Amino acid sequence: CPVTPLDASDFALDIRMPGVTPKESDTYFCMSMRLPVDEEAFVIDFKPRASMDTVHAMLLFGCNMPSSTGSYWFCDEGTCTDKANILYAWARNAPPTRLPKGVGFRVGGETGSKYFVLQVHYGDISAFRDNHKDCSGVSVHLTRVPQPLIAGMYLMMSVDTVIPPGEKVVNADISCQYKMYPMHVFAYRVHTHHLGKVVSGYRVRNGQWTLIGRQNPQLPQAFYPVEHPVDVTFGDILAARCVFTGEGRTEATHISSDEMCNLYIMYYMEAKYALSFMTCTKNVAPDMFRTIPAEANIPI
Ligand SMILES: [Cu+2]
Ligand code: NI
């Protein structure tokens, strides 16, 4: 097939799979890079270096303690033992979002992610590549120069809805009250396991819904650009609906076991008042979903 300093303030780190040999199709490899600095640094850019022939997708996470110590591992074992803050999502034939000017992820120091964990997913494998080494990964741009806007993730996950067997349509709803400084959403990622039909994200302010993003979870799960970023402010509600099918299923499915309904909202905040991670696992305002826009029920 290390560390490259660019100027006084900046430097570049590339996180590459260490010459792995995926044997078969639909296989996920995970690896880790500890952060070279112990002071706070800002990830301000990404360069993907994926072999076009065999790599379906790549995920970059930041987390305090990862799932394995070895040069690489299967991500079926896990990504991080702790919160995996997703930093980067690349998919073949997918728009990779470019962070807006002056946006950087805060890493290192007291609060910031200690490690990067790289996930590479390989979907198309020839059996006449029984011993070919791949060094797939991404290049990260770090600066110690402080950024005015800090990127972070609002993770919306449906902790319990059950899909009754054979129900053609089942709705998974998540809502939380926003009680922080203003967050500006520039991207979103939706995740689900093959019963999902559509995932839609909304800001609700004074009973008026504003769309963040709608996607089919069966498509490439990259980060989709929010064409005009949504401002989410204190006293707003974030509401999300996942649509599922119970069709063809013998038993009830759970959303530990079975299904997932996850919405990833990528945002920026003024550095002064910024926090990197927020989560919602509640549906505080269930009654409100009657008034949900009709678009949210329209499939893709
Ligand atoms: Cu999942
Ligand atoms: Ni191990």
Author numbering: 47, 53 to 306, 310 to 354
Copy text verbatim from the article accompanying this structure deposition.
The two recently opened beamlines for macromolecular crystallography at NSLS-II have launched the microcrystallography field into new territory, with flux densities up to two orders of magnitude brighter than those previously available. In this study, we highlight the capabilities of the AMX and FMX beamlines at NSLS-II by describing structure determination from single crystal vector data collection and two methods for multicrystal data collection. These new opportunities mean that inhomogeneous large crystals can now deliver high quality data collected from their best volume, and crystals as small as 5 to 10 µm can deliver one or more complete datasets.
PHM is a dicopper enzyme involved in peptide amidation: it hydroxylates the C-terminal glycine Cα in the first step of a sequential two-step process to produce the amidated peptide product. Amidated peptides are frequently secreted and function as hormones, neurotransmitters, and growth factors. Crystals of H108A-peptidylglycine α-hydroxylating monooxygenase (PHM) were approximately 15 × 25 × 10 µm in size. The structures align well, with an RMSD of only 0.6 Å.
